[PDB]
Design a protein around this ligand. Sequence first.
Ligand code: M32
Ligand code: NAG
Ligand code: NA
Ligand code: NA
Lengths: 251, 28, 11
Amino acid sequence: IVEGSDAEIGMSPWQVMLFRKSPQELLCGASLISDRWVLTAAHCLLYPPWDKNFTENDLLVRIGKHSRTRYERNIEKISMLEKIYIHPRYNWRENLDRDIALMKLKKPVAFSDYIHPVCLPDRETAASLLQAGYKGRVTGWGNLKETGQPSVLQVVNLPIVERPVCKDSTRIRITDNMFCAGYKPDEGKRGDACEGDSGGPFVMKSPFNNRWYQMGIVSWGEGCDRDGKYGFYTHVFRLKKWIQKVIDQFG
Amino acid sequence: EADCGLRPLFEKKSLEDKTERELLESYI
Amino acid sequence: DFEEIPEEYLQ
Ligand SMILES: C[C@@H](NS(=O)(=O)Cc1ccccc1)C(=O)N1CCC[C@H]1C(=O)NCc1cc(Cl)ccc1CN
Ligand SMILES: *[C@@H]1O[C@H](CO)[C@@H](O)[C@H](O)[C@H]1NC(C)=O
Ligand code: NA
Ligand code: NA
């Protein structure tokens, strides 16, 4: 996360770290959506241009974390993966369209002060909140700048951007399964996701019921925190039918 | 489940985090 | 860079 700040303890209890077994290293962010299901970006698991193709046994998920590198004894919980599901129309060849994946845990995780699931949006909450100017929150242990790494989880609040502005900021083809967020050059403030934040959540707090909803998944950006560029996020609600199909069939 | 999105150390105790008000203020 | 995790999780 670029130009963010240290998270408060328990500020993002749905935050998940995808951790590579060997060598031991951060792979991506992710989020907890139930006691057995974790949501992330497809490109965290499958990205052939960079020779990335992880299988279940390659990874662990670490939940309840704050420190990036420490083993947080008595606080974090580490889970093995039962199965990975990648969206069947995930477009890694072109523009990361439908950049979404689910991971089922081998065993349910116990909720605690530090471990708790985020809500997924329904159509109405999506319609109400996914509006230009409305701000969401992005969290992760990714790099602090494009070209170092944080001691603890970082957080940044960013406004959703008008679709035509998103489109005009890039030569990449944008789709309805993406939205973009970030400040404009003229707005003074800044901030963005970066390498390592991939797969983490873009969340919003509904003013109607005071619950946090995951509206986006950290997907892509041209560099990190560049003037006139924006971060692009997978539109969770647009892909919720697939999410439900997977959970209903394999849950 | 029914408890999703309510943080034990915040919403569950009616405590606010330091920047959530920034979000609320943007929801005009 | 990362602290070693208990071996139980690597088996
Ligand atoms: C599109 C690609 N951008 S890239 O890596 O920085 C390479 C690039 C730089 C400048 C112009 C075009 C391309 C990208 O973002 N990718 C390619 C596959 C993984 C994903 C990624 O890094 N996602 C993380 C991310 C997510 C967001 Cl929301 C913002 C910034 C970043 C870091 N670039
Ligand atoms: C990725 O890995 C699977 C097997 O582990 C393989 O069958 C597949 O062809 C690889 N590439 C993909 C899915 O693009
Ligand atoms: Na364009
Ligand atoms: Na920018």
